[PDB]
Swiss-Prot record, chain A:
The keyword Cytoplasm applies. Optimum pH is 7.75. Keywords: Cytoplasm, Hydrolase. Pathway: Nitrogen metabolism; urea degradation; CO(2) and NH(3) from urea (urease route): step 1/1. Belongs to the urease beta subunit family. The gene is ureB. The keyword DNA damage does not apply. Its main location: cytoplasm. It is found in: Cytoplasm. SUPFAM superfamilies: Urease, beta-subunit (SSF51278). This is Urease subunit beta. It comes from the Bacteria.
From Swiss-Prot, chains B, C:
This is Urease subunit gamma. GO terms for cellular component: cytoplasm. Its main location: cytoplasm. Belongs to the urease gamma subunit family. The apoenzyme can be activated in vitro in the presence of nickel ions and carbon dioxide, which promotes carbamylation of 'Lys-217' of the UreC (alpha) subunit. Heterotrimer of UreA (gamma), UreB (beta) and UreC (alpha) subunits. Three heterotrimers associate to form the active enzyme. The apoenzyme interacts with an accessory complex composed of UreD, UreF and UreG, which is required for the assembly of the nickel containing metallocenter of UreC. The UreE protein may also play a direct role as a metallochaperone in nickel transfer to the urease apoprotein. Its EC number is 3.5.1.5. It catalyses: urea + 2 H2O + H(+) = hydrogencarbonate + 2 NH4(+). It comes from Klebsiella aerogenes.
UniProtKB/Swiss-Prot annotation, chains D, E, F:
One of its GO terms (biological process) is urea catabolic process. It is an enzyme of class 3 (hydrolase). One of its GO terms (cellular component) is cytoplasm. Keywords: Cytoplasm, Hydrolase, Metal-binding, Nickel. This is Urease subunit alpha.
Amino acid sequence: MIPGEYHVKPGQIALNTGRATCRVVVENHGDRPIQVGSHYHFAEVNPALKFDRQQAAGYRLNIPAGTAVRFEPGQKREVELVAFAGHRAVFGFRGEVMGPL
Amino acid sequence: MELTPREKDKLLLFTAALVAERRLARGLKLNYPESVALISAFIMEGARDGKSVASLMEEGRHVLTREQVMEGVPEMIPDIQVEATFPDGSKLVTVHNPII
Amino acid sequence: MELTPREKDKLLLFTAALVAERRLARGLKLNYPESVALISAFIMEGARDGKSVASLMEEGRHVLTREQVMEGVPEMIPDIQVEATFPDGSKLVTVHNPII
Amino acid sequence: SNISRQAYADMFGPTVGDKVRLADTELWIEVEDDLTTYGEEVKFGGGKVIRDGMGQGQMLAADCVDLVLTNALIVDHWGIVKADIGVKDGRIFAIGKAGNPDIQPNVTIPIGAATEVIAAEGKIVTAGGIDTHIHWICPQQAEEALVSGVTTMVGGGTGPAAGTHATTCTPGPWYISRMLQAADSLPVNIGLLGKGNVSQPDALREQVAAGVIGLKIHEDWGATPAAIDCALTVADEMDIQVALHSDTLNESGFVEDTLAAIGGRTIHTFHTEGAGGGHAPDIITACAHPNILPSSTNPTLPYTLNTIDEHLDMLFAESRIRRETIAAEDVLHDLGAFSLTSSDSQAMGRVGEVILRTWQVAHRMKVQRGALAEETGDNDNFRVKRYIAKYTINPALTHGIAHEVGSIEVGKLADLVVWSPAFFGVKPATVIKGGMIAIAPMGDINASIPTPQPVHYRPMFGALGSARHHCRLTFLSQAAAANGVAERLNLRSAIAVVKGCRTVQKADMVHNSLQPNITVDAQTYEVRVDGELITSEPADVLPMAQRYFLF
Amino acid sequence: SNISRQAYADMFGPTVGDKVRLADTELWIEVEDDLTTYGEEVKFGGGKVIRDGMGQGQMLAADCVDLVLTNALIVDHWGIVKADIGVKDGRIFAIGKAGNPDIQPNVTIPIGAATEVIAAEGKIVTAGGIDTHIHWICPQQAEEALVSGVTTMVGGGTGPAAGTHATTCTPGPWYISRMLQAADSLPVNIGLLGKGNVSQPDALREQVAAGVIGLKIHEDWGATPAAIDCALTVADEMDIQVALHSDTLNESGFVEDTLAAIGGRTIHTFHTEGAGGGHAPDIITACAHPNILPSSTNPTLPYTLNTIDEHLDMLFAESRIRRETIAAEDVLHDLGAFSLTSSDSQAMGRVGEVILRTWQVAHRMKVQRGALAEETGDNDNFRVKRYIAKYTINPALTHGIAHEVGSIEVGKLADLVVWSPAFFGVKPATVIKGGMIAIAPMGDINASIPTPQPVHYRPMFGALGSARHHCRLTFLSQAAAANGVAERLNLRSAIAVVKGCRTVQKADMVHNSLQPNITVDAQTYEVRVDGELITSEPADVLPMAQRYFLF
Amino acid sequence: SNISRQAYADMFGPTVGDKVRLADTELWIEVEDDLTTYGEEVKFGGGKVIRDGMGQGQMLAADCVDLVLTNALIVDHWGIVKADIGVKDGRIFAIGKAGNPDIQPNVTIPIGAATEVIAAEGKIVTAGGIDTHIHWICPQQAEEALVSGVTTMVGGGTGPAAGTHATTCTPGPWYISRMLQAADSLPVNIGLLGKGNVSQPDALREQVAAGVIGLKIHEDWGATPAAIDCALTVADEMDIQVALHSDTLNESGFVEDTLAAIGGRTIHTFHTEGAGGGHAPDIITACAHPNILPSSTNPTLPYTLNTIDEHLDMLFAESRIRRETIAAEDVLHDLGAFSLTSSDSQAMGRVGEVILRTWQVAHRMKVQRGALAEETGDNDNFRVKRYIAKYTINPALTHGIAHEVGSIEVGKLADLVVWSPAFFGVKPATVIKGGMIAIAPMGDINASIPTPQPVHYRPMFGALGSARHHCRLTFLSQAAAANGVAERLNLRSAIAVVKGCRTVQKADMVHNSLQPNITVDAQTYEVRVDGELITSEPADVLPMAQRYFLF
Ligand code: NI
Ligand code: NI
Ligand code: NI
Ligand code: NI
Ligand code: NI
Ligand code: NI
């Protein structure tokens, strides 16, 4: 007996189903580490991260909500992106879009 | 003495630990509050003695064992935290999984 | 510990009993508050041990005798009541004429 | 991508199909539904979802909620579901999916710059409890009740006076006015009961017009057929509730005589089992009638080994305290024949144990009787809904305040209690009153973080001065409200009016509408329903007890 | 039928002829009269008298009392009688026979639906005490005093500041205003004293107009003939009282010079014995004059074995602390030469021991001197009336507030203290302020009854927010009241005005009007009245001490 | 006549040339000036100076001060001088020579009948501290801070909610209004910060118009260039301050990108060293800019042996917690590169240790680096002025409230702290709020004097109800004040408006205006100023620690 214990049924959960995704190779050219959150507009991340920003437009990381991906200096890796939904209107970040798309 | 609110608050912790201490002495399996109080008071005295944070983080995991507490208690206490005045001022001691 | 108001209130009772306990140990004849505190704390520990209400109602009348308290004290205490968490929850223990 | 169910539960709390043990009892709940879109859950923190342009939008305050409880596991009379809870203007705005519609799908609870966040993942959220049997013997009872998870207190009294020690009555306009004024100082919603024992209607109307939301008929002031009839007549015309503690002495008549005096009119019977007062030894038969809303006081819940012993000396007594009716009471609760639980604070009841004892009874009944006929699935969901209703929605309906409080439904006051599963029903993680945290466990004030020892309940901002007044309600009768009592007494808290006290009947009690054909043997005191004997065994050890309390 | 006297006393408290021991002292009181009709006593409870149609009538609120204290044994300056006490609108309505005129005879206090009940059978009821020597060093003093049975506090101060540590003065309009505002937060009646040490009348008039009900002349600010004369002149024109702590140093003159400066005008002399301050070593001779209202502070009451030792280090000191005058003081109180007792809170006095010490002196005097010349019967009734007057009616008369408080008489504020005989003067059972219980002993908040341990004093509803404001009084000078000070400062409590401070004289002090021909030997400090030496022996053990206190 | 210097110091406190050790540290202050006239010092007591016609004059209240602190040793940013302090209408009236002009010379602070006295001889008096990094996690923090000597608290929060646990933000009009109302209940001056993380200006303007005096930009809500720019634009138009906790993850850019977004606009950078949050690992370079007002949170002050160990588990963490920057921070404070100290209450900071830790850093720096280049004489006067400015005047200037509080200058609110030299910075003797003592050490309430044990901090009259409202300030933005927010919410306390938040720059920080050419090695984290390595050694034992605290 363990107070308040869970009895989680085995298996897995499929995240962000039915949505457009794309893979992008990203390389950190900066001298300091960079960490990106699940819902950040990928196309507007720290400028030291080199990748096809045009392909990442309107996309965010296809990772469980709340988690992040870290890039140590010089690190290169391929990440999977999933498209924003809702009104698909981007406001904030580096102020590059500030409107729909 | 000019006791501040925090000093008086700690008197409450100390007294709760006195209760637990006598019960452990009788041979009882401690419950949740008694366990937290006992280990917490141990750390405060450790700091008064001048032990380091690193040493207490380790020693604190050896105050009570799974056989000295009620069922489910170890899982109810993932960690115990307490601050006390060390020779170099107030420091926070975090004891992870204190009961095993 | 997440101590509720009632748990903290009982800490006051426990501490009052510590005072009485040391005085009885010195050989003093206890006064009114000391007597009430000592017998009350005895019952609370009894419940922690898992004794029944019926047993404590009897045992409580044998903690202090008329010769261990000041004159008039037994008559000032027609009964003593206290609640504690028994294995089966909170229960009220009433000790009638505890001092004889 | 994909994520395993265990890692998911650890991050966002359990989802559909997962089960959770309630504290250290044998009761297990299963998530029936989840209102999220997997991958779009909102989480707060560094690099998390609730940030500008992401999970947080650009809307003005008017278009977003003031507070969002994220990933909450709701346990209420209507369901056990996983969802985000939105709170706006101190009331429940929506139960759904929180976030920013600019980038997220299915958002029903918009989060903006004006939104505060309470992380509820891994926590169980319930409505605040409602205790309708309060003896206002001392003001300290409010904090004790609030800490236990009770946010509304209905009762009567003037302090530690003989009348109040025995009855839930605030006698007359003067004391009523004084107590309505004192109520502004307490962090719980409050409604007062006046002394209903009189055979002159005007003496009752004055009290209702002064502010009481009900009238208590207590045997100590004379629970005679004449007095009972008088109180019900006034209740019928002023839309207030009547609470009854009948004639234990059978002085003016037997239970059937009292029932005859009631004459089919709506009435709330206090401690219907009898130990706390009532026609010896068959007041319990009242639960068979359609106009009776029956409740139990808590010392007899549940039947344990020490029960009879303590009750006898706590209290002719042998005719009031009966093992037979005490054992039957637990079962009647399990069947839904008794619809409410309450305390009877400091007058044969424990103010901080209404919730705790309700769950102990549920545990003991599951252990002894197994699954209810209504249960579906391999969980205790229905029994949990039946029991939580006893101290939330049913007391609210009985006293005409269900339009304001009593459950987690849109438009109702945001009185919510957040619980860690291991401490469910015992020690809450956060108690919210009207949209603000009013009391919660708090560690060292001088610590670098809020968690270091000693951790104990301390009043928060929702319990302070004017913020408190804005987050609590003082219930008045329709007549008092119209007479301008609030303005005359210069009451500072929000005011609410009671209504619909005369039209509620046993059939309206959520999940507890059974009207059993119950009988009590005058000699043996044995309780039978349809001729079958109703009884149970006393517990030697109970959950939610020695594992959690220091004393 | 018939009932034995012992069973009767056990059921309704003692009656005519029965005697009761006061706590553990040697003082015994005898019931002088009983206002009941044997067989018609009102008792509350199951199957008792106060029930609909029986002891409770059908009258509307306006025709019945809000509260009735049943079967009380009243101990007041006017008598020691058994009776029911009726309270209406926060004031004493009647002392007589309670019940329902419909079925009972001789009812003078009608009990109706609007009536709350406090069972006082077996209890002693007294008026609330009045301490007129308060140093407002800290607000915590109010609770300490209230718990001891003191309901009105008159004094001065601004908090723990040097000026206040030494004197009972609230200096100037700003501090006066601030303290009048702070007073609304305290559960006792309050009146403030300003700094009277000035030789410019206008500086005093401003303070009176700001709200003070008196002016304190203290040697630390210069108790010179010029200052004394100035304060008395203003007091004479504004109807306020002057309190004096004379020139101990004999700097501006001797005691006869100060007396000459006073010039026959009314004045309250603080700690007239001298240890607490005053012309060394003969300030005590002031009690011989008709215009002097003399009081004692409590550390010297009564003379015990440890007295001199503690006083010396507590405090040239050898000229202020004199065994001769300290021993004489107890006797002068017994003879009625000294008319009041007070504390001198945290400035050579104990705020929670004014009442307790007054009774210890009475005990020690009975033990040493026997019965007073005024005693009649085999009881200590007269000595009890003489002493209770020292901390109730006499302080009220001295400060012009006797029209509101000070005794149990109709029309006065219902400030009452209920005592169990075994704890009389030590620990009250209930302290009522303006008709509501303000503080009382209270057991476990979560208990099934209010009696389980731990039992300790806790604030009740009469001490909460707006209810408190309605049950306490802030005393103002006639000028402040007229100037609209209450409206300007937005004071929330009830306001009362002082009057008749200039016309009271020694002859008006109830049971304490003796003007002895007293002398003090300049060399030996010996006190003589009519040439005879006045002295007493120091106690080694006192009642109301170690048997009741934990520390 | 003549008097020896030692006897003089014992009677009136030290004078010109005498040195005093601050608590148990190695810091010594030397009296720079004395404003008295030897022989004319005012002293209160029996036979002393402040008496009618002597040190006390005949003037009316309007022509004299309400309170005088006699013979105080003032320690402020402008000097360390011996003088009398006059307080009138709750504000600092004058720093000079108190007394009566009728008989004394050079009197600048007239003492009259309306004057209260606080004896400060032998005591050090300072302005009340100002903590601008408060997380309103619980109301108990106010008492803790007040007891430590902090009288103004600026921060944000709604109670123990996830958003507040992490950020100093009171989100939106509803919570802002509720918290402004709750503020009337607390004994400290209060100003609130709203959530500044939004890219829509109107959502920010609403919050400012609701009452916040600043906007907190925190990485947990998204510290992006877009959000930063938006908050600064609104701050520039509404004259409010912006506090920043930058992007530690370097997600939106590096430190240079954030600095670029700021674009030379005024901003207060929280915990500029980085451990408490900010661009890893070079946020510390911000102290080189003219528009950045940099502060430190207290857990890293000063660098000790246990620091790294506790911080690591308190908190990728290895990039935030750096020994290199933690050691450099102490030195940067000593050089005046960092201008403020604050707590970061219960979110990686200790609310009652802002003052204590500031002095421990000063001690450790003196011990390691010796005298500052600015020091003159054989004392630590300049280092003391540089450090006291960090928690008094500089925080006041940074947040636009220096016109009301922050130092002991005429016209400012009388928020003063009296310290005995042996307990300087650790345990105050008296804390005065707006002219009234609000909290102080107090012994046995029932004692004959205020000094007997147990002595512990207890609320005084300045912390009670209406007196409290009159002695505290609630700061509002100019827009809120104009919109009538105080009248709408019915705020009872005095109101003050912030102004001049946009025009303050690093050059305005008193004694802490250094703009070093500082660099941080991306790999090693080493801090260099002008190429030289900045570092220090960790303390094994600190003053103001185990000698004073029970736990
Ligand atoms: Ni009842
Ligand atoms: Ni009841
Ligand atoms: Ni005096
Ligand atoms: Ni005095
Ligand atoms: Ni931060
Ligand atoms: Ni912070």
